[PDB]
Amino acid sequence: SPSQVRQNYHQDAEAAINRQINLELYASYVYLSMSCYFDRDDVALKNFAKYFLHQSHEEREHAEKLMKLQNQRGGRIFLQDIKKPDRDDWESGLNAMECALHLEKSVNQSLLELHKLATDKNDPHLCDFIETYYLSEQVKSIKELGDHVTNLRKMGAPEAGMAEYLFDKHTLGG
Amino acid sequence: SPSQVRQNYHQDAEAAINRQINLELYASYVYLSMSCYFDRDDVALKNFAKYFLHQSHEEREHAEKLMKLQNQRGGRIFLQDIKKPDRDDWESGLNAMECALHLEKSVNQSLLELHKLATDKNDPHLCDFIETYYLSEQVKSIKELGDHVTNLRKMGAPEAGMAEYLFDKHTLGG
Amino acid sequence: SPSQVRQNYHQDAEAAINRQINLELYASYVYLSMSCYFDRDDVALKNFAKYFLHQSHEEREHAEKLMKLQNQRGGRIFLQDIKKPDRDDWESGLNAMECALHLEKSVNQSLLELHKLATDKNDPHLCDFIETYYLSEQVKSIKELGDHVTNLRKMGAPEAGMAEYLFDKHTLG
Amino acid sequence: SPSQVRQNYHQDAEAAINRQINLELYASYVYLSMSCYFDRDDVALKNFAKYFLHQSHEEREHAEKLMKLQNQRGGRIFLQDIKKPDRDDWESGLNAMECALHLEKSVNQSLLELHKLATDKNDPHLCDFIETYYLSEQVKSIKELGDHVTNLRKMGAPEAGMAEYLFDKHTLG
Amino acid sequence: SPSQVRQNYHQDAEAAINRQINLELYASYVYLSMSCYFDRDDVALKNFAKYFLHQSHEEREHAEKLMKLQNQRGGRIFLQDIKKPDRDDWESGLNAMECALHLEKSVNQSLLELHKLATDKNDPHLCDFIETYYLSEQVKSIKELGDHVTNLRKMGAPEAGMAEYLFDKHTLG
Amino acid sequence: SPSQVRQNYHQDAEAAINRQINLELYASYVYLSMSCYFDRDDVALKNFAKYFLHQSHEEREHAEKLMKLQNQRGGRIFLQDIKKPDRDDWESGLNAMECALHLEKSVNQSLLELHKLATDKNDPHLCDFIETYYLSEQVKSIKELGDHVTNLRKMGAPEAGMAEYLFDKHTLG
Ligand SMILES: [Fe+3]
Ligand SMILES: [Fe+3]
Ligand SMILES: [Fe+3]
Ligand SMILES: [Fe+3]
Ligand SMILES: [Fe+3]
Ligand SMILES: [Fe+3]
Ligand SMILES: [Fe+3]
């Protein structure tokens, strides 16, 4: 019945990876929607779009790595519907960063509980895997997104329209 | 209020793109699933997996180009749920190619009707856009999957053991 | 009388090319006027000048390619006067971008009508020629101009001083 | 049963491609004959021969590119006899160019008939395939051949001796 | 009020530069009409068109430089209609060279009058500008067009049709 | 009536070359049929396709060299209809090789008769021409196709599915 490679891999941990894979693919789809917003003619911020397009592809990459982990440990992949993002119009550059900040913190919460579940079942490989390739990256993203909000707020976006334009050119342009 | 860049871009075409975007994103999620199936330890065909992963990212690329088209013509993007693949287990190498063959014909089928619509609304830009970047790619990709199914069939897949193993090395290896 | 190389080229289509050849040359002259407005000392926006001068050269290049299409298909070119632009002063960078957008949209409306006639006279080469080299760039340029107008509106041009100046260095530079 | 890759590909389109294939091969054979004529010791125009040899191999490629299309869409390649050229002695450099001009307009006419068949059966892939790789090249080859005739006529060929000799070196060489 | 940069720049000179700008744009637009003529399938002189297109682009660059002068000195550019060429059919290469020689001499005439105008108003910058970038160039152009008209006559154009063909390859190639 | 270059070139040998030209053009056509067959979606052997397409073009090179031979010896090229291949469906990789083997032996027989006839008429140049560029080349093609026929039979083609698929990669790739 079980996979020939399976060893110290609980069936609950297997299910939480399938949930995370879906939650990672959900993140990718949200960031893709954001990118499209800033590429609109009535928004027209290419480096906001380019930034969020890059973030979308990393989430696609994060989803694929869990799928490889699932198969590595002997667990089987089962995919669900990827839900559409909560909103289509994201208003402005600032709001998108704040929705993204919340999105990454939600993903981080799912990973922490996943790591908590991995610890409870004495799964040190899965605890190492989440520690190395995910928890560090989420802390880095959450801090980065927090910085972008901190500056945009100070600059006076979105009321002062010259704020988001100058952010797009300097911070996201290099 | 409406798009200042909009011109001769009928509102049904705008909607037909939104459904076409979801179709290309679906196809990517179908290919992603297939790639991971051959990555399982009880299937273990590396170049089958690597092949379908490439097809998935091309279907992702195709979706993003339609999303760019939507913004170019002054349309507005509205996203739906990306539905899961009809099955989780893809039986064998031959079967996945046959499922991919049929999938591409459904994607092409939609594009033809999208061209038919675009021709009836007298939109030469959207007609040439589909002609240039999609109909050529679909006919080429269907022919390719037709060739693979043939070779895997003649070789005796999947009951004959070396059929898919040798095909993974020779044809899908390079 | 008819040319040795003439085949499936309707006389209505032939004349429609010459009208377009004039419209492309007119668009070039409009863009040359715009470019010079920013070259003025009391406007002094050097990248707005480079931008519209480049568009002025490409509209000439578009006009040159339509002329080449006329001779390829055996039709005869008949040039008309080139009209002057409807205004000399363009006020600001934003206003010039908004005018340019309407110009490109009006040129596209001429190209769309030209494609219609080709379909109604069963000329597939002429339809392809317009599709391949013209409609693609119009939508692309229109979209680009739409972006420039959107950004400038939000920044607060032309009444906010640094709006157009900074746009000059960042987007156009 | 039909092919596994077949979709929106009519029976008349499939069969029209087979005729179009034989036409391109026939044209290749015509150009091949022209080329070998100028290699004769009593004609001896090397760049006339090398020019028409080049047009022979490009037709062969056009014929091979249709066969590629035939297999992609799920149709099947039925071949036919390639008819010998209507004449062997092409007389002069001017006459061969006039005969090639006629031949290229005939092939272009057949591709136009093929396009409206593809248009009638709502096959946009076959319409684009013809638009992209054939119609545009046929207009160029007809125009190119027309230009060559026009010069040779003004030079005074074939009565004028150095007309075809110098055209060989300058325009073709 | 006068521009901040305006100094020793008379309004008649300002107005005459704008009339010159139009004449430079007219000169350009004439050359393009010539270029289009030689690209025709019944004329088919490739380097003739090459030559006349080059002159069109240079006359365009001459006008753009005169516009830059207008803004440099403080003047303001007022554009006018660019009149169409006084004929559509240019008949021959020899005739187009004679019409071009005629054109350049007329443009030189205008600049000679623009120079004395500047001389009268004691404008040493504008006198130098015209001497440096225009008067020397117009004499060079007229001399070159003199040479081609001369060479084309002595060769026997346009009755000997091989003459214009060989002048296309050897002098303009 | 006799060509200025012609010497020791019997008119039977001239007529025989014209038949060989047609036979080489036939052989080129048969290979083109075979190549296209393996490019079908339901066959899908891309290197078999490449192998026979290469032979088709080398048969055209053989034909063209014979056409150059004809003009060198003052003979005149008279072209006939290129007959269509005996079949459209070539069945399998094995069958195509055996048909190719039969074709190369048919062509070789026609060459040996052409050489025999050339030896009867004491035409030592024509004998050497067929020895140097055709006879030695044919023996190789027949030997090479002999190997491919043997290996496919040994592997158990086409009944064993992997036979021709694997032969496609290792031998022909
Ligand atoms: Fe993630
Ligand atoms: Fe796709
Ligand atoms: Fe344009
Ligand atoms: Fe089209
Ligand atoms: Fe052709
Ligand atoms: Fe000038
Ligand atoms: Fe041979």
Numbering used by the authors:
A (entry chain L), B (entry chain S): 4 to 177
C (entry chain T), D (entry chain U), E (entry chain W), F (entry chain P): 4 to 176
What did the authors write?
Ferritin is a cage-like protein made of 24 subunits arranged in octahedral 432 symmetry with an outer diameter of roughly 12 nm and an inner diameter of 8 nm. The symmetrical positioning of three or four subunits in the protein shell results in the formation of eight channels connecting the inner cavity to the outside and allows for the entry and exit of iron and other cations with a relatively broad selectivity. In the present paper, a high Tb(III) affinity LBT sequence has been genetically fused at the C-terminal end of the heavy chain of mouse ferritin. The tag has been designed to be located inside the 250 Ǻ3 wide inner cavity such that the lanthanide ions diffusing through the surface pores could eventually bind to the LBT sequence.
The structures of wild type apoHFt-LBT and HFt-LBT Tb(III) were determined by X-ray crystallography at 2.85 Å and 2.65 Å resolution, respectively. They both crystallized in I222 space group with 24 identical subunits in the asymmetric unit (ASU) with a solvent content of 64.7%. However, the model building process allowed to position residues just from 3 to 176 since the LBT loop was not visible, probably because of the intrinsic high flexibility of the C-terminus region. In a similar way, in each ferroxidase center and 3-fold axes of wild type apoHFt-LBT structure, a significant electron density peak was indeed observed and ascribed to iron ions (refined with occupancy <100%), since, although no salt was in the crystallization solution, the X-ray fluorescence scan displayed the presence of residual iron atoms. As a matter of fact, residual iron (5 atoms per ferritin 24-mer) is consistently present in recombinant ferritin H-homopolymers, most likely due to iron uptake within bacterial environment. Accordingly, the crystals of wild type apoHFt-LBT lacked these emission energies.
